[PDB]
RNA sequence: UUUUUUUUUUUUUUUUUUUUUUUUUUUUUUUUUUUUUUUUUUUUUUUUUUUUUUUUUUUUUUUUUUUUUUUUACCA
RNA sequence: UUUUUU
RNA sequence: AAACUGAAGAGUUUGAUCAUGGCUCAGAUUGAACGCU
RNA sequence: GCAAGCGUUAAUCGGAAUUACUGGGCGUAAAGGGAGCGUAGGUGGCUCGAUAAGUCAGAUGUGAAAUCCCCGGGCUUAACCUGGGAACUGCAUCUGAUACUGUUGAGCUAGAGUAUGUGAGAGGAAGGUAGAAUUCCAGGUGUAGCGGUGAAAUGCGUAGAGAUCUGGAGGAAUACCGAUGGCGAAGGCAGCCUUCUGGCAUAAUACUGACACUGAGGCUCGAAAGCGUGGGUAGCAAACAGGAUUAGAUACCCUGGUAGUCCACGCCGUAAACGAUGUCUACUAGUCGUUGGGUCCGGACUUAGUGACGCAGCUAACGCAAUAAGUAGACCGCCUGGGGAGUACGGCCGCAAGGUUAAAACUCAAAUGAAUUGACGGGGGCCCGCACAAGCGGUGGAGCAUGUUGUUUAAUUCGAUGCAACGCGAAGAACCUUACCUGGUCUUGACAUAUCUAGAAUCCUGCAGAGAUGCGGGAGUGCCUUCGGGAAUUAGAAUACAGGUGCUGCAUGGCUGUCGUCAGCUCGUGUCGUGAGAUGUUGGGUUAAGUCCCGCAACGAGCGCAACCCUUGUCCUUAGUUACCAGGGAACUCUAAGGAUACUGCCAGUGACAAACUGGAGGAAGGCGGGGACGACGUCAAGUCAUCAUGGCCCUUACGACCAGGGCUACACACGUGCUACAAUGGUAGGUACAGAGGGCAGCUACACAGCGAUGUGAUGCGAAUCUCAAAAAGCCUAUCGUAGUCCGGAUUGGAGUCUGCAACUCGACUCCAUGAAGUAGGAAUCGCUAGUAAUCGCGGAUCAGAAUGCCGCGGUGAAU
C-alpha cells in the first residue's frame, strides 16, 4: 500500500474524467449520489456484457450515459429490446430521460477492466492462478499492447497463508504522467476468500 | 548467673552535649536504552527495645525489663 | 579509559 | 547340447550448495511368536 | 497392495564401497607415530648357469550320499520324488615347463658404501674473554620533584630523590651484521677466541661389489613448563601485596614482588613437537629469485639445498603442483558419526606432577570440511542526510486545552502502543452521533425478494405514557388499462430470512504507515563454476541519482532516478467586466487561457583529446531557478474484519431492534502533543497606515436606532472581480506605567446576561462586573529549523444548529549560523 492510482495521478494530464457535468455547492452531491448509484446498478445488472467504462454526462436533467462494452449485442438485445428496458430504469432512478448510447471496444485485450474481470471469471472457475495469469499476459501481449502487469493477491490455491504474486511485459511505466496506462482493480470471490486482480496495460504516450 | 558492650530508617552503621536525627545500600518517581542493567536526576523514610523517672523540654539524664555480643562461672 | 544482557 | 545370466537407491545436518559422515527405510529369510481373521 | 492369509515384534544378511580382498581413506572433514636408529619381519639391481620348492599344465586317487545348478522322467499341475550329468573352487602323489618368486654357483656396476683433495656452516661439547645496557653500592654537583597512566593513585623523594659525573660489585643476554640466509634427524642452534668432535657439500681417480629400502616390539634423542640435590640471582616475572578501572574485577592497566628463568648433575617425555603433509625410489611443461660447490666462455651450464609463481594431472572445494596433495612401487603408522573420553578400571613408567596403553554403559540425529549469498563487527576505505558541529527558538518547571495510562465507576464504548500509539480513527460526544450503563419495550422485526387478503397514498385529530408506543374519530377514492387488472402504498399470514460496530488483520481483498524520494532492485541471452551462485550491477572518474562517460565476458532490457503534471519567478499574444485610471480611455495593474525563455546555449580554465567541474558575460531567472504531487523489488504475520468488501466461527423473543435518562466530560496520579504567560524589544490609552487567500440563500450583511458589551429590531445589496464577511494585527507617532508578583500574568470562583437549539444541571460558546491562582525563565534530559526558512503577527476554511488553543491553508515582518 504505497502506490497512487494509476487513473486518479493521469486524470488531468492525459486522462479524462469519466464524468462530465457541471453542478452547484448544493446540487452537486445529490448529482453526484445518483451518479454512483446508476454506476452501482449497471456495474450489477451488465455483468454478463462485458462492459469497462461507463461515463455519465448529464446536460441540464437530461443525461447521456455512455456505457463501452466489448459485447454490445448482448446488452442491445434482439432489435434493441433490453437497451429500452435499460433505458426505462435508468430514467426512473434518475430525473429525465437517459439516453444510454452504447460504444464498443474494438480490442478487449488492451482494457485493463476486461482482463481483470476476465482473470476474475476464471479465478472463481477454479482455473489455476498462475496458467490465467500467464494468459492474460500472453492475450494482451500480442494484441499489441505495449506493456501489461498483472497482480494476483490473496489465497491463491486455497493457500492459507495470503501472497501476492505479478507477471510484467513490457514496459508499463507507472512513473510517467504522460504514459496512458489504463488500470483497473476487481476482486474473484473464491471459495476462500477474495483474490484481488490489478491489471496495468500501458499503450504510448 | 556475674561484670562489661550495646539496641535508632528496608538493612548495616553515625550522633547527641536535655533543646535536632545521620551516611551507605535500598525503595518510589523521572531520565537515558529497542527493552532491561549500569548510569544520571528527584523524592520518601525513624514511638531512637520497652518501661517507670527527672526536667519546661530526654533517643540523650536515672531505674527496670528485654534482645545482642563478649568475659567469667572455680576447690573439694 | 569505561558498550553486561536479550 | 546345458550346467557359464549378474550388481537400482531414497530421506535426514544448510538460508541454499558440494563433500564428508552417521542414523533410518524400501529386499530376502525363519523350527518363529503375537494381534485380527 | 496382498489374500486364507495379512500385519507387528524378534533375529540374520543386503542396501553399507559404513573394515573397502574384490572395493575406502589420513594438508583443512576422523585419521602420519615428536624425531631417529635399529630387531623380528616384509620387500628388493643387471648378466650367464643349476635346481624345480612356489607358480603353471597334464595324469591318477580322492573330494560320501542328499542339497545347489543343467538335461530329462513320475505324481491331474505344482510343491515333491527321481535317473544321468555338472560342480564340489580342495588335498595328495607322479610327470612335464622354466617367464616370474624361492634356493644356489660365477660374473657385473648403475643402488649403497670406502680412500684421497678442496669448501661452507648460529651442528654439538668444554673452557676463556669483550663491549654496550640494567640493577645495587660508595662518593662530587645540585634542588624539588621523580615515576607512572587514557587519567590517576600506590610507590620513590628535602633522612636530598630523579638528572649529571667518577669508582666498585654482580648476573644475564649477545644490538648492528641478520637475510622465505645457514647448519642440525627432529627438538633446536647467533658476541669473540682456543680445545675436543659429528654430519654435509663438492672434482677426479681408484676400490667393494646389491653390502639396499622400510621397519611391529625395543632403544636413543626430544621445546617450554615442572621435579630432586647443590650453587647463583642483575633484569623479567607465575603466585602474592597494594593502587586504579568497574555494578562487581580473584582480570586486563600501574607499582612492587617470590618461585622460575641462569649453572652442575639427574628425572620428566609432553607441545598447534606443524608443512596439521611417514620414510625411501623412479618418472612428469616451464619462468624468476637465493645459498654452498663445480666447469666453461660479465654471463652460460651443471649440482645439492632453499623460496615465489605456473601447465598437465589431481582435489569436495580451498588448493597442491620436480621441496606434489601428479603418475607408480616398497614398508610402517593411523581412521571408521558427535559426545561420554584420551575418561574409568587394570598394567607399565615416574620422586611427584603425571605420562603411556585404553574401554563401557548411556545419550544425541546429527557433529563436521570447503565454498556461496546475505547480515553483522567496539574491521578497513569512500560517501550522503538539520546526523553532528556552528547558531536561532523551544519542550522538560506554572496555569489551561487536548490525547493516553492508571485509577474510579453502573458504564466511564471500541480501536491505535518503540521510531512508524498518545490534538491518532474523531473534518468538531448536551439530545442525535453512540457503538457503553440503567430502565421501559418488539420479535419475519427499522431494512430486501417470494405471497394472498382491503384500501390511492396522504392529511388533520383526541386521550394515556418520559418517549418508544396503545386505544379510538373525520375528509380524499388515485392514474393507465378497464372488468385478469399493474410501477407506490398502509396494518399480518407463515416459512425462507433479515439483522449483528459479535470474534479471528495470524484466513483475506481494498486502503495506509514505515525504512525512504534512500538509490537502488532485478530479468533475458551469453559466458564461468559439479553446485549454491557469479558476471552484468565491478573498476577510473563524475553526479542529487545504477546520473553520465570511459574501461571491462559481457551484450541488452525492465521497474526505480531524471523528464513529462501543478504552483511561483520575467515577457508576449487573445480579452477588458462587476477589473484598471497614464492621457471616456484600451495605456497600466489585475484577472485567466495560450505561448516565449534556460539548452552547460557562449567565453576562460581544470579534466583520460571524455563525462564533468570551476569561474564569467548576457538575462527576471544558471546549472535540479524555488515549492509540491509522483514513493522501486521488498521489510515489519506493521495498522485497519469499527468505512467498506469478504473465508470461516458465533447470536437468532437476541450479541438483533426502538425510546427516555445517564456515561464517553469522574481524578491520589503519570506521560505525550499544544496554548497562554512569567513582562519595559513590554502593558494600557489615543490617533495613523500596509495584505493575501477563502467563505456567503444549510447565508454574509451596508446603514439607522437601543444597549458598557455579547447582541436585538428595522432595513439595503449580493449566488457575488458588483454587496458582504472585514476591521488585518504585528508596525509608526504621543502620553503613561518605571521593575513591582506590578497598570505583568488571567487560571479559579461569585453575580447578571446574549445566542444556538425541544432542551446549556450533568455538559456549550461568548458578553459584562467583581475576584485575581500559580508563574520572576524552568533538573536530569530532550526537540524543530539552512532563507522568505526559523522566530513572531494576525486572517480564513472543513467538520459544524451551537461548540478549536487541534487540523488544513493565507499573507505581514523577518533573522543567526
Do not use: C
Not at 461515463?55 to 450515459?65: D, N, V
Request: glycine share 10%.
Amino acid at each position: 500500500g504505497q502506490k497512487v492510482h494509476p487513473i486518479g495521478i493521469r486524470l488531468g494530464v492525459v486522462k479524462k474524467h469519466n464524468a462530465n457535468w457541471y453542478a452547484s455547492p448544493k446540487q452537486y452531491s445529490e448529482y453526484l449520489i445518483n451518479d454512483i448509484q446508476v454506476r452501482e446498478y449497471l456495474r450489477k445488472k451488465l455483468d454478463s456484457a462485458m462492459i469497462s467504462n461507463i461515463m455519465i454526462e448529464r446536460p441540464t436533467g437530461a443525461a447521456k450515459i455512455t456505457i463501452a462494452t466489448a459485447r454490445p449485442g448482448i446488452v442491445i438485445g434482439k432489435k434493441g429490446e433490453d437497451i429500452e428496458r435499460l433505458q426505462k430504469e435508468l430514467t426512473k432512478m434518475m430525473g429525465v430521460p437517459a439516453q444510454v448510447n452504447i460504444e464498443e471496444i474494438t480490442s478487449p485485450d488492451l482494457d485493463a477492466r476486461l482482463v481483470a474481470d476476465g482473470i476474475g471469471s476464471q479465478l472463481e472457475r477454479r482455473v489455476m492462478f498462475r496458467r490465467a495469469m500467464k494468459r492474460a499476459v500472453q492475450n494482451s501481449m500480442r494484441s499489441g499492447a505495449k506493456g501489461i502487469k498483472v497482480e494476483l493477491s490473496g489465497r491463491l490455491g486455497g493457500a492459507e497463508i495470503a501472497r501476492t504474486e505479478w507477471y510484467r511485459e513490457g514496459r508499463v511505466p507507472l512513473h510517467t504522467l504522460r504514459a496512458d496506462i489504463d488500470y483497473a482493480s476487481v476482486r474473484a470471490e473464491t471459495t476462500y476468500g477474495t483474490i484481488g486482480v490489478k491489471v496495468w496495460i500501458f499503450r504510448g504516450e
